[PDB]
């Protein structure tokens, strides 16, 4: 094999909840297991918002989600993505976990 | 009396005026021309001045405002705006 010193391919190296938990533990120290197991997310608002620009009209996806463990902790998160709605939901989940 | 301006977007002078110093060659030329005007051209009186010009222009014929920068830098400190 010709692997570089460190590979980063989890299937070829020679979902929203998991990535949210990992990034949150990396950035703020939150426990991944608590996020993945106990928190539950429901999207509240999902829409498409547009911006005019001299070249053309640019569309983006806005998501507002609410997360909570159903035992007294609740947080609201908003996410924007020009590419896809799923990424907007991912960012909203991230923010909601941050705003618990 | 003291006049206090409102909170302004900027503090800048539209046209800063700089004190360029008139070239020595030009004023020496003017003095020579006045000499030849009064005494006469190639007059004995002011011929010495000619020598100076002959040197002063020999090598070459003729031989910046930071107010806006300092104003922009200092405005937040001196404007005296209310707290928040």
């Amino acid at each position: 094999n010709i692997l570089p010193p460190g590979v980063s391919l989890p299937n070829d190296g020679g979902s929203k909840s998991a990535d949210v938990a990992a990034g949150l533990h990396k950035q703020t120290g939150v426990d991944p297991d608590y996020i993945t197991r106990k928190l539950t997310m429901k999207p509240l608002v999902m829409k498409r918002v547009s911006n005019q620009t001299g070249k053309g009209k640019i569309a983006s996806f806005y998501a507002l989600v609410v997360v909570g463990d159903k035992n007294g902790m609740v947080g609201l998160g908003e996410g924007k993505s020009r590419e896809e709605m799923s990424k907007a939901i991912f960012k909203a989940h991230w923010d909601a976990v941050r705003n618990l | 009396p003291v006049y206090r301006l409102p909170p302004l977007p900027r503090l800048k002078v539209k046209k800063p005026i700089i004190r360029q110093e008139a070239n020595k060659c030009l004023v020496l030329m003017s003095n020579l021309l006045q000499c030849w005007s009064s005494y006469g051209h190639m007059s004995p009186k002011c011929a010495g001045l000619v020598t100076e010009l002959k040197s002063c222009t020999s090598e070459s014929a003729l031989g910046k405002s930071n107010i806006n920068y300092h104003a922009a830098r200092l405005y937040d400190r001196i404007n005296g705006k209310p707290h928040d």
Partner: protein, 66 residues
């Protein structure tokens, strides 16, 4: 500015995070801040006496006194 709540209640937020399970390890400052409560009153206090000269503030001489 409004009197800020979040600066002085860091202990309460961290306690909620810890008990909920969102945070697993107590911060090193948690026990110290618990032992030393922050002062959470921001009140304008009345002054009745000028220290420099001793003049008493807030006194009215009634009609009977004359």
């Amino acid at each position: 500015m409004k009197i800020q709540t979040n600066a002085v209640n860091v202990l309460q937020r961290t306690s909620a995070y810890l008990k909920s399970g969102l945070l697993k390890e107590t911060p090193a400052w948690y026990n110290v801040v618990a032992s030393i409560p922050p002062s959470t009153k921001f009140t304008r206090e009345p002054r009745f006496k000028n220290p420099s000269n001793g003049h008493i503030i807030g006194k009215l001489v009634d009609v009977t006194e004359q």
